[PDB]
Amino acid sequence: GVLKEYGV
Amino acid sequence: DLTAFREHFAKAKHIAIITGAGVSAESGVPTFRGPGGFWRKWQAQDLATPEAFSRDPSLVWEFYHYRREVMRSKMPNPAHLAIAECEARLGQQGRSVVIITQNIDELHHRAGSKHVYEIHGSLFKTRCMSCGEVKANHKSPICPALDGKGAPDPNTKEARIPVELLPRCERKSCNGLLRPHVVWFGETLDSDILTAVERELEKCDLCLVVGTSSIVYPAAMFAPQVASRGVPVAEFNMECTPATQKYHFEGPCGSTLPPALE
Ligand SMILES: [Zn+2]
Numbered sequence: 001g002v003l004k005e006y007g008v
Numbered sequence: 009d010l011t012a013f014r015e016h017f018a019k020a021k022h023i024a025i026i027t028g029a030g031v032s033a034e035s036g037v038p039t040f041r042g043p044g045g046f047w048r049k050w051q052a053q054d055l056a057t058p059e060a061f062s063r064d065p066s067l068v069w070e071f072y073h074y075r076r077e078v079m080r081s082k083m084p085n086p087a088h089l090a091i092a093e094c095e096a097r098l099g100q101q102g103r104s105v106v107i108i109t110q111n112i113d114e115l116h117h118r119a120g121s122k123h124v125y126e127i128h129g130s131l132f133k134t135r136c137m138s139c140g141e142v143k144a145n146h147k148s149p150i151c152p153a154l155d156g157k158g159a160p161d162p163n164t165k166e167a168r169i170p171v172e173l174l175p176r177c178e179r180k181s182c183n184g185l186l187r188p189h190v191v192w193f194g195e196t197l198d199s200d201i202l203t204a205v206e207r208e209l210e211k212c213d214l215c216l217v218v219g220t221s222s223i224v225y226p227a228a229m230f231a232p233q234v235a236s237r238g239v240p241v242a243e244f245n246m247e248c249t250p251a252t253q254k255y256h257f258e259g260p261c262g263s264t265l266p267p268a269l270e
Contacts, residue, residue: 001196004128005225 013255013268016240020103020214024234025091026227027109027116030219030245034262035085037113038078047071048162057193065185066169072188073150074158076131079113080148087218087244087261088119094269095121106208110226112190125205127197127226129190136177138184151175209234218244218261244268 029039039045040052047055050071054060061068084092095105107116107124112131116124132146149155153173177184191197209215215234222231222241231241235254242255244264249256257264 001199002202002229004191004193004195004197007194008225 009255010257010268013240013242013257016214017268022104022208022212023094023098023106023214023216024208024212025105025107025216025218026220026230027107027111027218028220028224028227028245029111031085031087031261032111032113032115033219034087034260035082035113035115037082037115038075046162047074047160048164053193056190058195061187061192065171065174065187066167068187069150069154069169069174070158070167072131072158072190073154074160076150077148077158079131082113082115084115084119085262087265088115088121090266090269091218092116092120095123104211106212108205108208108230110220125201125208127191127201127205129188131188131190133189134175134186135189136179136182136184136186138177139179139182141177141179141182141184142189143178205230206233210237213239215239215241216244217241218265221245221247242268 033039040047045051055068055071091105091107095107098105105123107121109116109124109126110128112126112128114130114132132144133142134145135142151174153169154167157167157169171185175186177186209230210233212234215231217227217231220227222228222243235241240254242257244257244259244261246258246260249258257268
C-alpha cells in the first residue's frame, strides 16, 4: 500500500 | 496561453481534477506544516501518526476537535465552487468531472461537488478501532467531554480526557474507540480508492492539478500515468515556473480557476 508522502 | 487551454476544455469529455492544500489554504484552513503552522507546541508530523494516538489519544483528539470546529467558520472559496458548478453544468451535457483530493476538510462537498474521491479521508468521518466501521459525523462537539477543548494556545492545559469518555462507537455491543478517518503519517492509502482513481485517470482526456504540483506527492503518482497517454495537464498553484518554460497558471486558485472553467 502506498505510504503517504511516500513515507518521506 | 489561456485560450489554448480553453480550446481543450471545450473538447474534454472526462475531466479529472486533483486538489492539494493550496485550495484549502485559500479558504483559511490551517495545514500546520512549515513556518508558523503550530498547534500549541506541535506540528502535524508530531501528532498525525498512529503512535501519537496510541500514546495519547486525548491529545490527538483535542487536536482534531479543534480542526473540526475551525471549519464551522471557514467556507469554500471560489475555486471550490467553480469546480462544483463545472461538474454540475458538464454533467447535464453528459460530460464527466471527478475530483481527487488530498484535503480532509470536506470543502468540496460543501461547495456541491459530488464525484469526489477523498484519498486522505475526512475530518468528519470516524473509524472504529474495534469493529472498523466508518460513519459520517459532524456533531459539535463530537462528544461532551471535548466541549470547548482543543484550544491552540501553546500554554493551554491538556484536557487529559479518559479514553472511555472520548468518542466511542455507537453499536453498543461494540463501544469501540473512534479515531478520525484520516490517513496518518506512516499509513497506506486505501487500495479500493486508488483502483478507482486509476480507472478514472485512464479515462480522462484532461487533467487539472490545483493548489499543488504535478511534481510532488500526491499528483506525482498519477499525472505520469495520464501524461504518458498524451493527455494535457494544467496546474493552478502559486509555485513559480522558470523563464525557459504542460500549462501552468500562476496565482491563487480562487482567482485563476473560475475564469478558466467559465
Ligand atoms: Zn465499533
